[PDB]
Amino acid sequence: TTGVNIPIITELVNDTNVQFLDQDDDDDPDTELYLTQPFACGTAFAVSVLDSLMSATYFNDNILTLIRTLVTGGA
Amino acid sequence: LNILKTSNSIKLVNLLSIFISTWLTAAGFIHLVENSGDPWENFQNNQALTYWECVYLLMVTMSTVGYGDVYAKTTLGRLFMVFFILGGLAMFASYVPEIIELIGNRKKYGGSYSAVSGRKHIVVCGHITLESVSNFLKDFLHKDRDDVNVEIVFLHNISPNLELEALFKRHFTQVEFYQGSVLNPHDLARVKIESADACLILANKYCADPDAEDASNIMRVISIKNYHPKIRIITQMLQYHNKAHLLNIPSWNWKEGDDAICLAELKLGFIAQSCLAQGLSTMLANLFSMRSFIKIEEDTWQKYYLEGVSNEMYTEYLSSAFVGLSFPTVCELCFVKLKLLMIAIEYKSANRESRILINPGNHLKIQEGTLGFFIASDAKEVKRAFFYCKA
Amino acid sequence: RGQRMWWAFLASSMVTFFGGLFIILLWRTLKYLWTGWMTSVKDWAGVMISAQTLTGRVLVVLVFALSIGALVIYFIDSSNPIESCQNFYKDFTLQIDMAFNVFFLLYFGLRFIAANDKLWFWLEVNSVVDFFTVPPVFVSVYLNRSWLGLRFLRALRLIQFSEILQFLNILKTSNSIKLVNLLSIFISTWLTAAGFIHLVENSGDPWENFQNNQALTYWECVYLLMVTMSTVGYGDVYAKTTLGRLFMVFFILGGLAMFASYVPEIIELIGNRKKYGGS
C-alpha cells in the first residue's frame, strides 16, 4: 500500500511552522497551537506548551511527583 | 483603558503632552507677571499684554529666532526669562525632531492589486535585487517576441531603494510592486494569486550554503500549493539530489506542466557536450538570450559573430500542406523556400515524445497538428510557416 | 473699488473639490447597496502619461516648461493691487495665462484616467493644487475682475521635477536623485510660504475690515522667511497681523527642522570630488 498510515511523532522548536505538517488543514497564523489539527491529533509537539507547568505546581502541593511517576515510570 | 498598547504610540503621546503642557504653563506665568506690576514698586511698572501675545513671545524665545518685536520689561519677567532660557531650549532642541521622526512612518507599499478581466498576470517572489530584476525585465519584455499583454507583480519583504524605484518608474505600465511575504497566507490572497497564469521563483545563486536555499524554496512551493492546488510553478535549484524532494508534494503535477531547473546539472551538461565538439556550449547558450541585429562596418570577426548571435529559437505548428511528407523533405523545403531552419519536431501520441532528427521513410509526417521547433531572427518570421498555401 | 468679489473665487474652488469628493463617495456606496474598450482607453492614457512613445516624450517636456512659465506670470502679477478690474481683450497677459491653464486642465484629465483608485487619486497633492488654481482663472475671465487669491500655490508644481526627469531616463544613479529631491522640495516650500505671507500681510484682517494692512513686496517676504528660517531674526521687518503671526508660529515649528536637517546634506553631497584624479 501507501505510506499515509504510518504513525509519526515530531518535535518542533518554533510553533508557527506547524501549518506545514498537513495538507488538508485550515492553516492560519492566528489560532493558538492547541487548536491546530496536528496537535489535536497527537502528532506534533513543542516544548512551548510546558511553560504553564510553573503555576500549576505552586498551588497544588505535589503534582510534580504524580507526573513523574505516571511518565518516567518510577520515582 | 487599553487604548495604547504599542510603543510608538506611547512615546509620541508622552512627548506631545509634556511639550504642550510646559509651553502653555510658562506662557500663563508670563501673562500674570507682566499684566501685573512689581510689588515693591507699588505696581507702577505694569505693561499690557494678552495671553495669545504671551504664547507667541515664548515660541520665538524657545526657537531662538529672537525677533525682538515684543519683550518682557519687569524684573520678575526678566528673571524668569533667564532661567527659562537656561532650561527650555534643550527641550525644544531635542523634542521636535523626535516627533517629526515618529510621525511619517508610513508603509508606502500596502494595499492590494485589482484584477483586470481578460488580461493575464504573473507573480514573482524570491531573491530580488537590482541586477536580477534588470536582467529579468530586459529579457522578458524584449521586442523580438510577439506582442505580449501579461502584467508582472513582484512581492518581496524589504522595501526597495532608489535605483529600483527608478527602474519601476521607467516601466511604469507593466510592473507593480507590493510588500509582504509568500509564507503569510494573507498576502497570497492580497495579490489575487487564485487567478494567475503562473508563479516564478528566483533564487540566490551566490549563497553560503546551497542546501538552506533549497529548503527555503521548497517551503515557499509547499505554502503556495497549499493555498491553491492547481497552478503552474517554475523554480530554480542549486543541487541535483534535492530535486527528488519536489515529487513528494502531493499535488506537484509535472505532467500538466511544472518545471524545475537545476543549475549544476545543466552547467555540467553543457561542458560535457563541449567535450565532444568544441564551442558547442557557447553556441547553445546564445539561443536563449533575446538579442537584436547589430550592424558594423569594420571587417573584424565581430561583424560575423553578431550576425550569428542575432538568432533565437521558437516553436509553432505546421501548415496542412505537409501531410504525407518525409522529415528531410520538409526540412530542406522549409530551408530553401522560407529561409527557416527546422531542427526537431515532437511526436503527438498517447504519451509525450520528441524526436531530434529523423531519417526519411522511418517516420513520415504524422500531420496530427504536429509541433515543430525552429531557429529564426524573431518570432514574427516563424509565422511564415503554418500559412504555406500554394502561393 | 466697489463691492469686493473675493468670495466668489474662493467659492468656485471649494465647491469643485468637495463636490467631486461627494459624487465619487456616493457612487461607490450606491453600487454597494444595489448589490474591454474602457481598458484600452486607460492603457493609451497610461502610455501617454509615461514617456514610452515619442508623443509621450514631447508632452512631458511641455509640462516641464509650462510649469515654470506659469510661475513667472505670478511674479509679475504680484506688484498689482490685490483687487482690480481689467479688460480681457485689451491685455496681453490674462490671455497667455488663459492659454496655459487650458493645457493644465487637459493634462489633469489624462492623469485622472490612468489612476487605479479614484478616491486616493482625488486626495493627492498635485490634484488639489490643480483644483485650487484652475477654476479661478475662468471665474475671473467671466467677471472681468481679478483677485490675487491662492495663486501662489503655483510654486508647488516644482515637486514633480524629480519624476518627470526619471521618466525621460536621465537620472540613474543614487546620488543625483537624492540631490534633486532635496533641492526641489526645499525651494518649493520656501517660495510657497513666502507667497502666503505676502497675501495675508498685504490684505488686512477680514473681521477688522482690513484696517490694519501692512505694505510689503514679494522679495521682502522671501527675505523675511529666509532670515526667520535660519534663526537669525533681525528686528527690521516682521509680521504684524494676527493671521501672519499665527502662520509664523507653525512655520517656526516646521521649517526650522527642515532647514537644519537639509542644508548640511546638500553641502556634503556637492563637492564629493576626487582631489587626485587626472592623467
Ligand SMILES: CC(C)CCC[C@@H](C)[C@H]1CC[C@H]2[C@@H]3CC=C4C[C@@H](OC(=O)CCC(=O)O)CC[C@]4(C)[C@H]3CC[C@]12C
Ligand atoms: C508665592 C510664594 C512663593 C511666596 C513668595 C513671597 C515673595 C517672593 C513675595 C510675595 C509677596 C511679596 C511682597 C508683596 C508686597 C510688598 C510691599 C512692597 O511695598 C509696597 O508696596 C509699599 C508698602 C506697603 O504696601 O505697605 C515691598 C515689597 C513687598 C513686601 C513684597 C516682597 C516680596 C514678596 C514677599
Ligand SMILES: CC(C)CCC[C@@H](C)[C@H]1CC[C@H]2[C@@H]3CC=C4C[C@@H](OC(=O)CCC(=O)O)CC[C@]4(C)[C@H]3CC[C@]12C
Ligand atoms: C528668588 C525668587 C524665588 C524670589 C526673588 C524675590 C526678589 C526679586 C524680591 C523679594 C523682596 C524684594 C525687595 C523688597 C523690597 C524692596 C524695597 C524697595 O524700596 C522701595 O522702593 C522703597 C519703598 C518700599 O519699601 O516699597 C526696593 C526694592 C526691594 C529691595 C525689593 C527688591 C526685590 C526683592 C529682593
Ligand SMILES: CC(C)CCC[C@@H](C)[C@H]1CC[C@H]2[C@@H]3CC=C4C[C@@H](OC(=O)CCC(=O)O)CC[C@]4(C)[C@H]3CC[C@]12C
Ligand atoms: C499650537 C496649539 C497646540 C496651542 C495654541 C495656543 C494658543 C496659540 C491659543 C490656543 C487657544 C487660544 C485661546 C482660545 C480662546 C480664548 C478666549 C478669548 O476670549 C475672548 O475673546 C473674550 C474677550 C472678552 O470677553 O473681553 C481670548 C483669547 C483666548 C484666551 C485664546 C488665547 C490664545 C490660545 C491659548
Ligand SMILES: CC(C)CCC[C@@H](C)[C@H]1CC[C@H]2[C@@H]3CC=C4C[C@@H](OC(=O)CCC(=O)O)CC[C@]4(C)[C@H]3CC[C@]12C
Ligand atoms: C489653535 C489654532 C488653530 C488657532 C489659535 C488662535 C485662535 C484660538 C484665535 C481665537 C481667538 C483669537 C484672538 C481674538 C482676538 C485677539 C485680539 C487681537 O488684538 C489686536 O489686534 C491687538 C494688536 C495686534 O495684535 O497687533 C489680537 C489677536 C487675538 C489675541 C486673537 C488671536 C488668535 C485667537 C486666539
Ligand SMILES: CC(C)CCC[C@@H](C)[C@H]1CC[C@H]2[C@@H]3CC=C4C[C@@H](OC(=O)CCC(=O)O)CC[C@]4(C)[C@H]3CC[C@]12C
Ligand atoms: C526663474 C524664475 C523662477 C524667476 C526668478 C526671478 C524672479 C523672482 C524675478 C526676476 C525678475 C523680477 C522682476 C523684475 C522687475 C520687476 C518690476 C517691478 O516693478 C514695480 O516695482 C512696479 C510698481 C507698480 O507700478 O506698482 C515689480 C517687480 C518685478 C516684476 C520683478 C518680480 C520678480 C522677478 C520676476
Ligand SMILES: CC(C)CCC[C@@H](C)[C@H]1CC[C@H]2[C@@H]3CC=C4C[C@@H](OC(=O)CCC(=O)O)CC[C@]4(C)[C@H]3CC[C@]12C
Ligand atoms: C482658515 C479657513 C477656515 C478660512 C477662514 C476664513 C474666515 C476667517 C473669514 C472668511 C470670511 C470672513 C468674513 C467676511 C466678511 C465679514 C463682514 C465684516 O463686516 C463688514 O464687512 C462691515 C461691518 C461693519 O459695518 O462694521 C466683518 C467680518 C466678516 C464677518 C469676516 C469674518 C472672517 C471670515 C469669516
Ligand SMILES: CC(C)CCC[C@@H](C)[C@H]1CC[C@H]2[C@@H]3CC=C4C[C@@H](OC(=O)CCC(=O)O)CC[C@]4(C)[C@H]3CC[C@]12C
Ligand atoms: C482652524 C484654522 C484653519 C483657522 C483659524 C481661524 C481663526 C484664527 C479665526 C477665524 C475667525 C476669527 C475671529 C473672527 C472675528 C473676531 C472678532 C474680532 O472683534 C471684532 O470684530 C470687534 C471687537 C470689538 O467689539 O472691539 C476679534 C477677533 C475675532 C475673535 C477673530 C479671531 C480669529 C478667528 C477665530
Ligand SMILES: CC(C)CCC[C@@H](C)[C@H]1CC[C@H]2[C@@H]3CC=C4C[C@@H](OC(=O)CCC(=O)O)CC[C@]4(C)[C@H]3CC[C@]12C
Ligand atoms: C540669483 C539669480 C537667480 C538672480 C535673482 C534676481 C532677483 C534676486 C532680483 C531680480 C529683480 C529684482 C527686483 C527688482 C526690483 C525691485 C523693486 C525694489 O523696490 C524698492 O526699492 C522698494 C523699496 C525698498 O525696499 O527700498 C525692491 C527690490 C526688487 C523687488 C528686486 C528684488 C530682487 C530681484 C527679484
Ligand SMILES: Oc1cc(NCCCCCN2CCOCC2)ccc1Oc1c(F)c(F)c(C(F)(F)F)c(F)c1F
Ligand atoms: O505679581 C503679583 C500680582 C499680584 N496680584 C495683584 C496685582 C494688582 C495690580 C493692580 N494694577 C492696577 C492697575 O494696573 C493693572 C494692575 C499680587 C502679588 C504679586 O506678587 C508676586 C510676587 F511678588 C512673587 F514673588 C510671586 C512668586 F513668583 F514668587 F510666586 C508671585 F506669584 C506674585 F504674585
Ligand SMILES: Oc1cc(NCCCCCN2CCOCC2)ccc1Oc1c(F)c(F)c(C(F)(F)F)c(F)c1F
Ligand atoms: O485674506 C483675505 C483677503 C481678502 N481680500 C483682500 C483685498 C481686500 C480689499 C482691498 N484692500 C483693502 C485695503 O487694503 C488694501 C486693499 C478677503 C478675504 C480674506 O480672508 C481670508 C481669510 F480670512 C483666511 F482665513 C484665509 C485662509 F486662512 F484660508 F487662508 C484666506 F485665504 C483669506 F483670503
Ligand SMILES: [Ca+2]
Ligand atoms: Ca498545511
Ligand SMILES: [Ca+2]
Ligand atoms: Ca533576434
Ligand SMILES: [K+]
Ligand atoms: K539663534
Ligand SMILES: [K+]
Ligand atoms: K533681534
Ligand SMILES: [Mg+2]
Ligand atoms: Mg497598471
